[PDB]
Amino acid sequence: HMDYKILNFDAKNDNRGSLIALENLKEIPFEIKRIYYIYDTKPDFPRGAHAHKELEQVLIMMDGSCEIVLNDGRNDKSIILNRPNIGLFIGKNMWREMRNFSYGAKLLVLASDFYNENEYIRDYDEFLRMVN
Amino acid sequence: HMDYKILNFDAKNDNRGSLIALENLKEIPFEIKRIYYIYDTKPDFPRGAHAHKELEQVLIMMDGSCEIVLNDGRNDKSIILNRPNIGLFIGKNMWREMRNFSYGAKLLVLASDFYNENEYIRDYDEFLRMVN
Amino acid sequence: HMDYKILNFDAKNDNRGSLIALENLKEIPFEIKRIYYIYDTKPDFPRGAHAHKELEQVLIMMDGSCEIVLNDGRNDKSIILNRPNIGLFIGKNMWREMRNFSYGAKLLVLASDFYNENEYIRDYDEFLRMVND
Amino acid sequence: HMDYKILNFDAKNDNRGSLIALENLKEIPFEIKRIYYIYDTKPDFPRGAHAHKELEQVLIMMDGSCEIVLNDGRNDKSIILNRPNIGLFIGKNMWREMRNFSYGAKLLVLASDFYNENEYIRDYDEFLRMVND
Ligand SMILES: Cc1cn([C@H]2C[C@H](O)[C@@H](COP(=O)(O)OP(=O)(O)O)O2)c(=O)[nH]c1=O
Ligand SMILES: Cc1cn([C@H]2C[C@H](O)[C@@H](COP(=O)(O)OP(=O)(O)O)O2)c(=O)[nH]c1=O
Ligand SMILES: Cc1cn([C@H]2C[C@H](O)[C@@H](COP(=O)(O)OP(=O)(O)O)O2)c(=O)[nH]c1=O
Ligand SMILES: Cc1cn([C@H]2C[C@H](O)[C@@H](COP(=O)(O)OP(=O)(O)O)O2)c(=O)[nH]c1=O
Ligand SMILES: C[N+](C)(C)C
Ligand SMILES: C[N+](C)(C)C
């Protein structure tokens, strides 16, 4: 019982393709203040390796695949994201890395707040002191 | 001088790839209430063919290409979206269609409000009466 | 009539996706000796700008779109490739460019012979001289 | 030692992107008679589940990732393909599956011979009987 959740999204499917709509405090359990997206990824060059005190996130794999590795201080879960109709809710005080990006994989992140470099914990031991 | 704008985004480029961050009332000229994204597109099956009174939008081509065709009531502009570091701001009282989607092209839309089927103008003549 | 053909491919479609199969002297009207693919393309960085007296090619956009521009010494013909089930045969004495690549668009090329840098014409003026002998 | 090889390809990289070239009896250790590509793949809809006495293949993920599962009648070997500059040679008397496709992932296959549905083994039990003669 870690603070993440798999979100299965409802798509409007038709001849012209698929559409997924995600709204503030409905499919998204917070108000979107920011989105960012990561592209030109490579499988040998992983990303993240950080935690956040207050910031909450929803991760959608727009293109390709990756392994999200989550850690709350004790046991740690590997979640593979590889389709656009699934999102990963990442709660508070959660260490995450993203590895094994398929070449050119495109990740989309929906953020509960504006970018704040100070509130990044980029040191795993510092994270563990903060958890305990 | 129609109510659209090309947005050239700043990317943090490094070994692990590219990251673009877009924030409420900074890179985005409104507060995000909703995002939706369109995938499994086809070049022979176009989309949109509608206008909106109040709703404002930012369009980002996450994958592949398409032609956005804009119309405000008089002259009409074709804008080709084909890279993730460019967004298209679509203002108020603007008719748009999206055609010539590359097979499997992925469009991302950032919306200034919650989904409201009533405020869709899906009739071009109705749109023109409303403009004049 | 310029020496190119649009090839419409038959796909085997099920709930697991689509398969296209291309064989020597059947859907491909030559013997594949080499294939090449291009990726990490950019809308603002076009490619091609060469011609070949002998080499026949078949072009397939596996991902995204680009604009193939074909010239046999008269006017440019643009052919948009934006789906994987269409191919473009390009015959002999054909100058070609490929521009307006969607970002990260991928092109597959089935070629009729082994790579010879010597047999490349990479100058348009050289190509017109060659076509006006 | 199972009859597969990981192929590392040399790419020509410039500011216009990357090109990989694959030739008969050079980077590909057979003569290409046919190529096929698969697209509109789904993580939950795996493909393959067949073997071939004669047909040699080279697999390349041009877009996205999948898990190739290889079996010559002993234990499964998983090989992840997730970049376009790696290929997977699959020799004779090899059962293969391809699963955990990223959504819309695209696979290119260079094949040593023309398509023969007759020469396909699409039953695993049939494959073990064949490998235990
Ligand atoms: C998330 C984010 C990052 N950045 C900057 C911080 C770094 O200099 C750079 C890369 O971010 P970084 O934290 O290293 O990325 P990841 O989570 O993929 O490991 O981008 C912003 O400017 N704004 C943002 O909203
Ligand atoms: C934009 C949007 C559409 N939809 C529905 C409306 C339609 O039934 C379906 C397709 O939308 P539609 O307006 O036809 O799409 P497009 O702008 O690409 O032409 O999705 C939602 O449920 N929520 C949304 O936020
Ligand atoms: C087509 C091809 C190119 N190359 C090399 C030649 C160049 O140095 C490099 C780029 O090829 P180039 O002709 O510049 O590519 P394009 O037709 O896409 O513009 O790749 C090979 O080594 N083998 C081949 O079969
Ligand atoms: C490989 C191949 C398949 N096909 C047909 C056979 C089947 O009806 C269909 C799907 O092939 P199948 O063997 O089911 O594909 P996979 O190996 O990806 O599981 O395509 C051809 O017609 N030619 C070919 O060269
Ligand atoms: C607790 N969780 C299983 C929903 C992540
Ligand atoms: C008016 N506009 C040129 C900025 C669209």
Q: Residue by residue, what is the 3-state secondary structure of A5-72?
A: EEEECCEEEECCEEEEEEEECCCECCCCCEEEEEECCCCCCCEEEEEECCCCEEEEEEECCEEEEEEC
Q: Which residues make Cβ contacts (< 8 Å) with residue D106, sequence separation at least 6?
A: C62, C63, C84, C106, D37, D38, D39, D41, D61, D62, D63, D64
User: Which residue in D15, D35, D39 is closest to C17 by CB distance?
Assistant: D39
Contact status, residue B35 vs residue B81, Cβ threshold 8 Å: no
Tell me how far apart the alpha carbons of residues A48 and A59 are, in angstroms, rounded to a whole number.
Answer: 12
Contact status, residue C51 vs residue C127, Cβ threshold 8 Å: yes
> Between β-strands C11-14 and C106-111, what pairing exists: parallel, antiparallel or unpaired?
unpaired
Nearest CA in chain A to C42: A40
The sign one gets for the Cα dihedral D25, D30, D35, D40 is negative
What is the Cα B90 distance to its own chain's centre? 6
- Tokens representing residue B47 in the block: 């989309």
Beta bridge partners of residue A67, listed in sequence order = A80, A99
Contact A106 B18 (CB under 8 A): no
**C-alpha distances out from residue D131 to D74, D93, D127, Å:** 10, 7, 6
Contact status, residue C53 vs residue C79, Cβ threshold 8 Å: no
Tell me how far apart the alpha carbons of residues A46 and C89 are, in angstroms, rounded to a whole number.
Answer: 40
A78 class by beta-carbon count within 10 Å (0-12 exposed, 13-18 middle, 19+ buried): exposed
Residue-range domain boundaries for chain D: 1-133
Residue among C20, C22, C50, C86 flagged as catalytic: C50
Resolution in angstroms comes to 2.5
A79 Cβ closer than 6 Å to some ligand 5 atom: no
Tell me how far apart the alpha carbons of residues B32 and B108 are, in angstroms, rounded to a whole number.
Answer: 13
Beta bridge partners of residue D47, listed in sequence order = D98
For chain D, counts of helices (H) and of strands (E) = 1, 12
List the determination method. X-ray
The sign one gets for the Cα dihedral C53, C56, C61, C67 is positive
Tell me how far apart the alpha carbons of residues C48 and D16 are, in angstroms, rounded to a whole number.
Answer: 10
- Specify the DSSP element, H or E, that contains B124: helix B124-131
What does DSSP assign to residue C105? Answer: -
Provide the 10 A C-beta neighbour count for residue D126.
11
User: Which residue in A63, A82, A100 is closest to D43 by CB distance?
Assistant: A82
Tell me how far apart the alpha carbons of residues A116 and A114 are, in angstroms, rounded to a whole number.
Answer: 6
Q: Rounded to a whole number, what is the distance in angstroms from the first to the last CA of chain C?
A: 20
